């Protein structure tokens, strides 16, 4: 089910898509993304897990988040996994991605916004149902209100239209989780010689209690999460719990009730409390991003990844991917503070490849650091 979309409206753009069922293997979709659509394996994957709630971010925080994400992503080739629906934070994030793409004087590195959207949420699905390979389907762009149905965003280059599973109404979440897990087990390069394991990272923006199960499943899959300090939903609960230092069942229940007065179900409240406790039990996979304080998303992403790697193991070869990513972002301070601090032994054979990468990509600070480190 491959087709092309020719969005018609203020800006005429061409976008690809593929229909898929929730029972498919994510390996096939990854292969079709890499080969059929010509997308190079990303050097960074940032998945959005929010912004579909009625309450939306303030324009200042929305702009700060989009600028930080685009600035972090533009160094390398990154993918931004969002629900390809023209609404909320997703619409503006796709707008920022397309604005960067148009203004990008270097097409070698490309920031691609992939859209994983449910088939039940698509407006005018019959219009794209034609999907003639010779003649791309014409799709009209309409800025619908919240409601329950949205239109495909024109700014998203590629789409993954998942069909709703008759078993449970969570097919899109399961597909997103499986896709993130599968992508996290790939190599960022064409060959496994100078390639890193793809850094998959999730971002939470004003989540609802319904997505707690998917978030915990992702955490079980061992992929880091970033929490906006001023998002508003479950993100506020998590940042308040982090500020507390410790989590208690009564405390989390009180915060959940205060933040979500509408939801009052004893079984649901208990399940969400248990899910939140189990999520906070990990901790090392959770990291808070405060745009009012830090406003440097790349630094926080690198810190979260290096924290996860350090929690995983102490071997030098394990830290290699994080060090290479730090090289690619000129974060010599972060690398010196985290990776090259006492605990990890560093041999010349271990550092030869990273030395090559820093030397080719014109990173003098990392060259100095590696020469000074063996």
């Amino acid at each position: 089910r491959l087709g092309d979309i020719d969005f018609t409206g203020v800006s005429r753009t061409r976008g690809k898509f593929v229909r898929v069922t929730s029972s498919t293997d994510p390996a096939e979709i990854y292969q079709i993304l890499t080969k059929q659509w010509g997308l190079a394996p990303p050097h960074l994957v940032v998945a959005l897990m929010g912004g579909d709630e009625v309450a939306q971010l303030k324009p200042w925080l929305r702009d700060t988040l989009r600028k930080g994400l685009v600035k972090a992503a533009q160094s390398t080739g990154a993918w931004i996994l969002t629900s390809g629906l023209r609404f909320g934070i997703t619409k503006n994030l796709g707008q920022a991605v397309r604005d960067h793409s148009l203004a990008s004087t270097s097409p070698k590195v490309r920031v691609v916004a992939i859209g994983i959207a449910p088939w039940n949420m698509i407006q005018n699905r019959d219009l794209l149902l034609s999907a003639k390979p010779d003649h791309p389907a014409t799709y009209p762009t309409e800025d619908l209100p919240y409601g329950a149905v949205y239109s495909l965003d024109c700014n998203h280059s590629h789409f993954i239209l998942v069909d709703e599973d008759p078993k449970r109404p969570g097919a899109t979440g399961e597909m997103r989780v499986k896709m993130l897990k599968h992508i996290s087990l790939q190599r960022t390069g064409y060959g496994g010689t100078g390639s890193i394991e793809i850094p998959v990272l999730c971002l939470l923006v004003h989540g609802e209690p319904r997505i707690l199960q998917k978030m915990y499943k992702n955490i079980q899959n061992s992929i880091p999460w970033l929490i906006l300090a001023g998002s508003g939903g479950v993100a506020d609960i998590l940042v308040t719990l982090m500020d507390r230092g410790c989590w208690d069942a009564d405390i989390v229940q009180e915060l959940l009730i205060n933040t979500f007065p509408d939801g009052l179900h004893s079984t649901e409240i208990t399940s969400w409390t248990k899910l939140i406790q189990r999520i906070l039990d990990h901790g090392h996979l959770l990291t808070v991003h405060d745009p009012e304080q830090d406003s440097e998303l790349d630094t926080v992403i690198l810190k979260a990844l290096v924290k996860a790697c350090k929690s995983q193991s102490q071997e030098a070869q394990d830290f290699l991917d994080e060090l290479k990513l730090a090289v690619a972002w000129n974060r010599v301070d972060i690398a010196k503070s985290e990776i090259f601090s006492g605990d990890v032994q560093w041999s010349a054979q271990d550092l030869e490849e990273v030395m090559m990468e820093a030397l080719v990509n014109d990173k003098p600070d990392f060259v100095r650091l590696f020469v000074d480190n063996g």
Binding site: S11, R12, K67, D99, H100, L102, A103
Partner: protein, 91 residues
């Protein structure tokens, strides 16, 4: 007067050079007294029927507008960052 005027005179020369080049754009390539041939040809073409100031396709125009907006945002961000790191602001 030379010492005080020369620097402004250079800028004024550049500003006038723009207009002179604009004039030379539409000037016929034949110098006088030959220029009469070009004038007759132009009159005949008008009776029978630019590298600067060009009009671009919609896609390219939108791309350049977005690129201008991105560059403006970068320039403003640089100004604000330089303001934050200034000695007075730090004090």
């Amino acid at each position: 007067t030379f010492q005080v005027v020369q620097e402004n005179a250079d800028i004024f020369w550049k500003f006038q050079r723009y207009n002179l080049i604009v004039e030379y754009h539409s000037r016929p390539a034949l110098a006088p007294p030959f220029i009469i041939i070009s004038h007759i040809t132009q009159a005949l073409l008008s009776f029978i029927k630019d590298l600067l100031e060009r009009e671009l396709p919609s896609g390219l125009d939108q791309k350049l507008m977005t690129w201008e907006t991105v560059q403006k945002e970068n320039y403003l961000a640089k100004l604000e960052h330089e303001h934050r790191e200034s000695s007075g602001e730090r004090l």
